[PDB]
From Swiss-Prot, chain A:
Similarity section: Belongs to the mitochondrion-specific ribosomal protein mL45 family.
Locations listed in the record: Mitochondrion
Record keywords, A-Z: Mitochondrion, Ribonucleoprotein, Ribosomal protein, Transit peptide
GO cellular component: mitochondrial inner membrane; mitochondrial large ribosomal subunit; mitochondrion
Organism superkingdom: Eukaryota
Assembly: Component of the mitochondrial large ribosomal subunit (mt-LSU). Mature mammalian 55S mitochondrial ribosomes consist of a small (28S) and a large (39S) subunit. The 28S small subunit contains a 12S ribosomal RNA (12S mt-rRNA) and 30 different proteins. The 39S large subunit contains a 16S rRNA (16S mt-rRNA), a copy of mitochondrial valine transfer RNA (mt-tRNA(Val)), which plays an integral structural role, and 52 different proteins.
A GO MF label: RNA binding
Gene name, Swiss-Prot/TrEMBL: MRPL45
Covered residues, full protein: 71 to 295 of 306
Job description of the protein: Component of the mitochondrial large ribosomal subunit (mt-LSU). Within the mitochondrial ribosomes, required to direct the nascent polypeptide toward the tunnel exit and position the exit at a distance from the membrane surface.
Lineage: Eukaryota, Metazoa, Chordata, Craniata, Vertebrata
Keyword Ribonucleoprotein appears in the UniProt entry: yes
tRNA processing among keywords: no
Name of the molecule in the record: Large ribosomal subunit protein mL45
Curated annotation (Swiss-Prot), chain C:
Gene Ontology BP terms: mitochondrial translation
UniProt xrefs under Pfam families: Ribosomal_L17
Subcellular location, principal: mitochondrion
UniProt family annotation: Belongs to the bacterial ribosomal protein bL17 family.
Species assigned in the record: Homo sapiens
Gene coding for it: MRPL17
Tissue distribution: Detected in adrenal gland, mammary gland and adipose tissue.
Localization (cell): Mitochondrion
Protein known as: Large ribosomal subunit protein bL17m
Domain of life: Eukaryota
Curated annotation (Swiss-Prot), chain D:
Residues represented out of the complete protein: 79 to 186 of 188
Gene: MRPL32
Annotated function: Component of the mitochondrial large ribosomal subunit (mt-LSU). The mitochondrial ribosome (mitoribosome) is a large ribonucleoprotein complex responsible for the synthesis of proteins inside mitochondria.
Chain spans, region Disordered: 86-108
Family that this chain belongs to: Belongs to the bacterial ribosomal protein bL32 family.
Protein name: Large ribosomal subunit protein bL32m
Positions with biased composition (Basic and acidic residues): 91-103
Keywords, ordered alphabetically: Mitochondrion, Ribonucleoprotein, Ribosomal protein, Transit peptide
Curated annotation (Swiss-Prot), chain E:
Protein name as it appears in the record: Large ribosomal subunit protein mL39
Protein's gene: MRPL39
UniProt keyword Cell cycle present: no
Main location: mitochondrion
CDD domains hit by this protein: TGS
Source organism (scientific name): Homo sapiens (Human)
Length: 214, 166, 152, 108, 293
């Protein structure tokens, strides 16, 4: 029952997550969702009156590109600087003993600020703001083994990608910044590129007294 | 103490050029502080040196030793970490490169003898070290042939020089 | 030198060997399938064949009654022997038991053996079965046997 | 009688790594095909025998439950019946032992 | 007229070009789902590469026991080679020599031994003399000797082989067994099959009949090293599966005109079913006896 409590700089959820509209990638209530977005916008503006939504998306793509370059060169300090504590471990622990070759080629269309949401005051005296941004870019990816053998992707071939990246800033923090919190992938998303190796999924392991049922 | 076997298991390599051999996978595993003698554990390791993973599992399953059971568990979980984390394709595509027993940290107990005499028991412990390499097991070295013996003798005879002169 | 010695030196003596084999035989008659060390199972297998011979000799015979009285220590198996087992093997001549090797005891690594009376109601043991007649060598030998039948 | 001198590690290695002291490789290991598990050619399969042992143990437990006490071994033969079948006309005067499971495929 | 070395080299070139054409027809990796429905290790799901992975690859995923004992594969109930690529999601079942009904495995072994004999024939006779290969008749297992029909030279209509010649055939076949070549399989169009075997009228007729019975006119070619032949079905993975081999007898068929057909008969037994010396001798004598289809 010590008076020192854990001082978190982020949350681990999305406040009213943007549900993906069907056919957004296939094609090359609005007033209510808009009005909620700008209610959250005047909350960010009140906590910091120097924020521009029209100026966000270039900073968002900058944060994304530099975070993935820090992922390329294993710069965990700058990755902490640009990436929230909820997004860091599911960024790094699947690549902890692997080599990742990532690059940014171009953007097909400019990124779009598509959702803005805010927290309540009660969150331990802290108020957080999240902004969801559509990105649709062309990237390259080549993840290597512990031994240097190739596992995923191709070295030179670029491919299209569409993500719903959600950034979060702690507004009450005097030194808070906009960092990547997560990314929504749609449930209707196209299936990912197949892996380069073969996988055996085992069946049930049967005790002697048990009989296999189909 | 030292845990360089685990650090060997977590060493990492640079990416591979597309015009060189595949550099087959290497998996390091060990069990520490096994209540068993390192000599008998050496006998079991020397039994399973150089075999395939399935062959080693068969021999350890049908051996009659507590160390055989322990090494079978170690090999099973080493194969599990092999095709779970080190990107080994087939779970049967492994062989034992290194199989070693080491001395553990033992304890001293008193052994009461006759008269007023005593001895010092050792509660002996041991480690087991294993290394798994992806690939078929390497072929055993063939025995030397009479042709090879004759060639070696003739090489010695032709390598003879006149000693202690110009 | 142990030339022509057909019996094993078991237990604490000859009396203890007989008592051990009697306990194993009583267990075999009660449960119809027991497991025990291999040597004891072999000796008690021989005694079980001879016990079924006495049971087929029958309950009205005083010698067979005395033999069953000695070799069955629980006294309910004597009706079970004389009116279950001998009626079961009345048709058969002398192959009353089945002995198979089961691998090793998990404590002292002892060579184990399961022994059952034939017939039973228990689930059958995973018996060693010969190769099917549809295998390659078996079809070649069947063709050979056919050709010899046509020849002679 | 005591050792006159200490035996060296070379002599000790020769003695302890003589090929008689080494563990011989077993050749009589084959896949039991009813379950795909390793067995020895002269030995019953451990997995199948273990299955048979647990089913037999449950049979004997039900026999004891019907039996109710020692020194009451029956005069009649016994059969085992599972769920979903009637006693056959050859199993008339035999003690029926009921089991609350489907009849295993390896049991006829 | 081309030399036999040139004919072999061009046939291997055509085989490799067609195989590369199929591998280019499947350029990108694609994941298929194979459900092992065998009695042992039941209901096991494999994620394999389309037109690249093999039943041998599935067995290597499972254990080396399946690799060493599995001879044929049931893919959706049809017999499949161990080294033949899988083309679709299916169910697999490995077949050994010692099953309840090993008849398909026996047929595959029998065809493989006949094809190896024909290779030994073709690379055994002399260059001044001509060798033409007719077919390997699908003779049943119970007959006792695998048979292979050869047209030999007009200068050799009168020549009968001797025991040393038969032992030389056996030694060449054992050299193949030692060499341990995999049985490469290719499902190929009839036009490419005719282009491969265009300098053999009997092979042309064989390919034409296979393309007639099959509506899409695809036939099966098999290769051990350099020798290519048209097969009647699935084959065993490797020549090292054969342990005991013998070229027992050579006979001449009844119609001498228009050409002399010579039936070469041998007998074999694999490693998993090797017989004793005396049993093998009796099988040798029955294989030396005539076999009619
Ligand atoms: Zn089994």
């Amino acid at each position: 029952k010590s008076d020192r409590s854990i001082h978190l700089a982020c949350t681990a959820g999305i406040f009213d997550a943007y549900v993906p509209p069907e056919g957004d990638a296939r094609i090359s209530e609005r007033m209510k969702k808009t009005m909620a977005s700008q209610v959250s916008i005047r909350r960010i503006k009140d906590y910091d009156a120097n924020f521009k939504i029209k100026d966000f998306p270039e900073k968002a793509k900058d944060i994304f590109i530099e975070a993935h370059l820090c992922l390329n060169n294993s710069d965990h300090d700058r990755l902490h600087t640009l990436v929230t504590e909820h997004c860091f471990p599911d960024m790094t622990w699947d690549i902890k003993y692997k080599t990742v070759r990532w690059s940014f080629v171009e953007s097909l269309e400019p990124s779009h600020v598509v959702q803005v949401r805010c927290s309540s005051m009660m969150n331990q005296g802290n108020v957080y703001g999240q902004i969801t941004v559509r990105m649709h870019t062309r990237q390259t990816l080549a993840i290597y083994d512990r031994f240097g053998r190739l596992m995923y992707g191709q070295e030179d071939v670029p491919k299209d990608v569409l993500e719903y990246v959600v950034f979060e800033k702690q507004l009450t923090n005097p030194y808070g910044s906009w960092r990547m919190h997560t990314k929504i992938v749609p449930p209707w998303a196209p299936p990912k590129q197949p892996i380069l190796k073969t996988v055996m999924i085992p069946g049930p392991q049967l005790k002697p007294e048990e009989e296999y049922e189909e | 103490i030292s845990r360089k076997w685990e650090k060997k298991n977590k060493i990492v390599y640079p990416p591979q050029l597309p015009g060189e051999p595949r550099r087959p996978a290497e998996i390091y595993h060990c069990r520490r502080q096994i209540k068993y003698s390192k000599d008998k554990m050496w006998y079991l390791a020397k039994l399973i040196r150089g075999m395939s993973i399935d062959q080693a599992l068969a021999q350890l399953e049908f051996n009659d030793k507590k160390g055989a059971k322990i090494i079978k568990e170690v090999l099973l979980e080493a194969q599990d970490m092999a095709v779970r984390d080190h990107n080994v394709e087939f779970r049967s595509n492994l062989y034992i490169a290194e199989s070693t027993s080491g001395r553990g940290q033992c304890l001293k107990r008193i052994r009461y003898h006759g008269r007023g005499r005593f001895g010092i028991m050792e509660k002996v412990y041991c480690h087991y070290f294993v290394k798994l390499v992806e690939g078929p097991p390497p072929p055993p070295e063939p025995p030397k042939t009479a042709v090879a013996h004759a060639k070696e003798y003739i090489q010695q005879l032709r390598s003879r020089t006149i000693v202690h002169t110009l | 030198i142990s030339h022509g010695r057909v019996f094993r030196r078991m237990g604490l003596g000859p009396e203890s060997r007989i008592h051990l084999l009697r306990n194993l035989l009583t267990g075999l008659v009660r449960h119809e399938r027991i497991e025990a060390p291999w040597a004891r199972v072999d000796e008690m297998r021989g005694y079980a064949e001879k016990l079924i011979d006495y049971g087929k000799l029958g309950d009205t015979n005083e010698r067979a009654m005395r033999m069953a009285d000695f070799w069955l220590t629980e006294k309910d198996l004597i009706p079970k022997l004389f009116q279950v087992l001998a009626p079961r093997y009345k048709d058969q001549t002398g192959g009353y038991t089945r002995m198979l090797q089961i691998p090793n005891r998990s404590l002292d690594r002892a060579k184990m053996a399961v022994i059952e009376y034939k017939g039973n109601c228990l689930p059958p043991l995973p018996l060693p079965r010969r190769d099917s007649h549809l295998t390659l060598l078996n079809q070649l030998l069947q063709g050979l046997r056919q050709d010899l039948r046509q020849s002679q | 009688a005591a050792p006159k001198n200490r035996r060296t590690i070379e002599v000790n290695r020769c003695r302890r790594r003589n090929p008689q002291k080494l563990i011989k490789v077993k050749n009589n290991i084959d896949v039991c095909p009813e379950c795909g598990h390793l067995k020895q050619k002269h030995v019953l399969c451990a997995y199948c025998y273990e299955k048979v042992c647990k089913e037999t143990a449950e049979i004997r437990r039900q026999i004891g439950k019907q039996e109710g006490g020692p020194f009451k071994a029956p005069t009649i033969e016994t059969v085992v019946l599972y769920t979903g079948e009637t006693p056959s006309e050859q199993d008339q005067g035999k003690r029926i032992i009921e089991r609350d499971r489907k009849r295993p495929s390896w049991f006829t | 007229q081309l030399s036999p070395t040139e004919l072999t080299e061009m046939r291997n070139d055509l085989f490799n070009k067609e195989k590369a054409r199929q591998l280019s027809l499947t350029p990108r990796t694609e994941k298929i789902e194979v459900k092992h429905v065998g009695k042992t290790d039941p209901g096991t799901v494999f994620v394999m590469n389309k037109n690249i992975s093999t039943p041998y690859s599935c067995a290597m995923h499972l254990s080396e026991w399946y690799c060493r004992k599995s001879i044929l594969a049931l893919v959706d109930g049809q017999p499949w080679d161990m080294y033949k690529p899988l083309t679709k999601s299916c169910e697999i079942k490995f077949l050994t020599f010692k099953d309840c009904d090993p008849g398909e495995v026996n047929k595959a072994y029998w065809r493989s031994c006949a094809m190896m004999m024909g290779c030994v024939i073709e690379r055994a006779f002399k260059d001044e003399y001509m060798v033409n290969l007719v077919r390997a008749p699908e003779v049943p297992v119970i007959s006792g000797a695998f048979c292979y029909d050869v047209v030999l030279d007009s200068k050799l209509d009168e020549w009968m082989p001797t025991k040393e010649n038969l032992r030389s055939f056996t030694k060449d076949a054992h050299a193949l067994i030692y060499k341990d070549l995999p049985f490469e399989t290719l499902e190929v169009e009839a036009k490419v099959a005719l282009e491969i075997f265009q300098h053999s009228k009997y092979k042309v007729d064989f390919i034409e009949e296979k393309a007639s019975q099959n509506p899409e006119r695809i036939v099966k070619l098999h290769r051990i090293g350099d020798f290519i032949d048209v097969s009647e079905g699935p084959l065993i993975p490797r020549t090292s599966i054969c342990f005991q081999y013998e070229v027992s007898a050579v006979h001449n068929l009844q119609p001498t005109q228009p050409s002399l057909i010579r039936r070469f008969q041998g007998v074999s037994l694999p490693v998993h079913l090797r017989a004793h010396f005396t049993i093998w001798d009796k099988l040798l004598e029955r294989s030396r006896k005539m076999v009619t289809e």
